[PDB]
């Protein structure tokens, strides 16, 4: 995790995906001043083991596509750092039934 101040040079960033398996992430200071997950509206998300996911699917008879999706650059998807394929479980409050379980895969 690398925290830059005002910005990074377009010559540098093109050096992150050049050493797998390892992975790197770029975050701006001004964006981390406040934690978005703390916001009234943002419900808590949760990563899912490639075990817990292969489950969710089987239990609903779903194919990867039929699953609601979250953006690879989505604020929270970055907060947790998902990866194309990882599924997040979204649990929130509800004025119809206290809590509601939702799932979001990633693209």
């Amino acid at each position: 995790i690398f925290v830059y101040q005002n910005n990074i040079t377009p010559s540098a960033m093109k050096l992150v995906p050049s050493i797998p398996p390892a992975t790197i992430e770029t975050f701006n200071e001004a964006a981390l001043v406040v934690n978005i997950t703390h916001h009234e509206l943002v419900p808590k998300h949760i990563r899912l083991s490639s075990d817990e996911k292969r489950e969710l699917l089987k239990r609903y008879r779903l194919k990867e596509s039929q699953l609601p999706r979250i953006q690879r650059a989505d604020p929270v998807a970055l907060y947790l750092g998902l990866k194309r394929g990882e599924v997040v479980k979204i649990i929130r409050k509800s004025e119809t039934s206290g809590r509601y379980a939702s799932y979001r895969i990633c693209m």
């Binding site: 916001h39 509206l41 943002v42 419900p43 596509s65 609601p68 999706r69 979250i70 953006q71 989505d74 004025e95 119809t96 693209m107």
Partner: protein, 112 residues
């Protein structure tokens, strides 16, 4: 959280009037608009571009334009869309038709 707002806003539009709509509806819509990825619009620009069949999207705002690129890209239509069948003249998989009916020859004997 966007969904949360998108809904909150839509809810306000119907509330400003002194009317009432049961969550579920505005929710459902607010949801159809979100799932896909971010903010898909309820317009020929968005939703009517999804993976849905051709014949379906075909019946709204782009028709031929859409049909053309359908056979050009050799699309395949499931015929699971209400629309799909209405165009073919077949019973749509809808309530009454969300299932099949059969004569169980077996049970057809215990009855006598």
């Amino acid at each position: 959280a966007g969904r949360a707002a998108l809904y909150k806003e839509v809810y306000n539009v119907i509330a400003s009037d002194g009317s009432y709509v049961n969550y579920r509806h505005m929710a459902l819509l607010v949801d159809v608009m979100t799932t896909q990825g971010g903010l898909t619009s309820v317009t020929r620009h968005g939703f009517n571009r999804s993976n849905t069949g051709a014949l379906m999207r075909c019946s709204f705002e782009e028709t031929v334009e859409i049909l053309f690129e359908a056979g050009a890209s050799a699309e395949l239509d499931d015929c699971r869309g209400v629309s799909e069948n209405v165009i073919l003249g077949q019973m749509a998989p809808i309530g009454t038709g969300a299932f099949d009916v059969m004569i169980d020859e077996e049970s057809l004997v215990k009855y006598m």
